[PDB]
Amino acid sequence: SHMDFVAFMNKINSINANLSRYENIINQIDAQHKDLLTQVSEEQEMELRRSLDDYISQATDLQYQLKADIKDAQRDGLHDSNKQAQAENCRQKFLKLIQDYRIIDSNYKEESKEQAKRQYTIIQPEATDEEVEAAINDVNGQKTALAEVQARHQELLKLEKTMAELTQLFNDMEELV
Amino acid sequence: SNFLAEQYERDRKAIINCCFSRPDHGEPPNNYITHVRIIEDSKFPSSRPPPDSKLENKKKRLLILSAKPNNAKLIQIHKARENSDGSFQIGRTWQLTELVRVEKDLEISEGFILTMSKKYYWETNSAKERTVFIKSLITLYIQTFEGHVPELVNWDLSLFYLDERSYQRAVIT
């Protein structure tokens, strides 16, 4: 049927539109991360984290929508080889972007730890390298440098929660093949 | 017809019953994740065996991935065998953090090399079984070590939902 054909292709086009939309958000997040690691004023850092929090929020919403639409498209192609192939192709591209997001947040977590460590040597010049690593790795023990250590410490906790969300989403999409 | 998947379930149930069901002396047993059947050459354990290696050298073994019960981030790799009475038994264990390099044999569809402290050459029974298991091994690594991967040699990066760009940002090297 003609109308049955463009209906499924409308689903694929919508998914592919949200896929590229999702890819842009992920790259904007990566860029906000690297800008936040520069010397910025208090008002400039607040503006950057405003956009970053918005981008993070958009990413979570698009992940819900892509999860539902890709699963729904896969069910429409259970006995149609052409429909199954397109939906599977959408599923693989979604997973690659989830992998990009995970790796992007992984890089930011390391560089945020390295910044928190170097910032801990200022607040405690006598502290040794091991005492610095142990302090940053939560928890045991919590100047402009002090507030940043507490801030990046609370940020590492939210990065780990986001990466746990991506792992769960990643496995939710693998229970489809 | 559908023997591969059905035998995988028998192996899974038997591996769990023999190896991941009784507690130690004294955490509970590890949690099974996946496995694959492998061929190990006893004379050529660390490199591709030459074609004229006699069949007596070929030993039936299995690789098993599991997780510690109270820490799903501590994954272990096991090499197991089937005893004469049919019981499965684990003979060698690595920590997943020991995995440094994973290489695909360009000439043998079933062969691969895992590098911990030593290099280990193994072969799956079929080409598809190498693809599925190595995908499970690498996927579990990225998930376990927060977006990191070991060195990958001669694999299609899209198998692990990676590209050259994301691989370079994630590799431990």
| CATH number of domain containing A109 | 1.20.58.70
Cβ pair B163:A106 closer than 8 A: no
| DSSP E strand boundaries for chain A | none
The residue of chain B with its CA nearest to that of A102 is: B147
| CATH number of domain containing B153 | 2.30.29.90
Range of the domain at B112: 1-173
Question: How close does chain B come to A100, measured CA to CA in Å?
Answer: 6
Cβ pair A163:B147 closer than 8 A: yes
Cβ pair A103:B161 closer than 8 A: no
Question: How close does chain A come to B148, measured CA to CA in Å?
Answer: 7
Contacts of A96 in chain B (CB under 8 A): 158, 161-163
Nearest to B148 among A104, A105, A106 (CB): A106
Named by the residue before each, gaps in chain B exceeding 2.5 A from C to N are 25
Cβ pair A163:B162 closer than 8 A: no
- CA distance readout (Å), A123 to A96, A110, A142, A143, B58: 41, 20, 12, 8, 61
Within 10 A of B143 (CB to CB), how many other CB atoms are there?
19
Q: Is A137 on the interface with B (CB under 8 A)?
A: no
DSSP state letter for B55: G
Residues 152-171 of B with CB under 8 A from A: 158, 160-163, 166, 169-170
Domain count, chain B: 1
Which H or E run contains A20?
helix A2-36
Pairing of strands B58-68, B151-153: unpaired
Domain count, chain A: 1
Range of the domain at A47: 1-177
Determination method here? X-ray
Q: Look up residue B125 and give its two tokens.
A: 């029974």
Closest listed residue to residue B42, CA positions, set B89, B91, B85: B91
| Rounded CA separation B95/B78 (Å) | 9
Within 10 A of B78 (CB to CB), how many other CB atoms are there?
21
Render B93-123 in DSSP notation, one character per residue. Answer: EEEGGG--EEEE-SS-TTEEEEESSSEEEEE
Residues B72, B74, B78, B82: is their CA dihedral positive or negative?
Answer: negative
3-state secondary structure of B17: helix
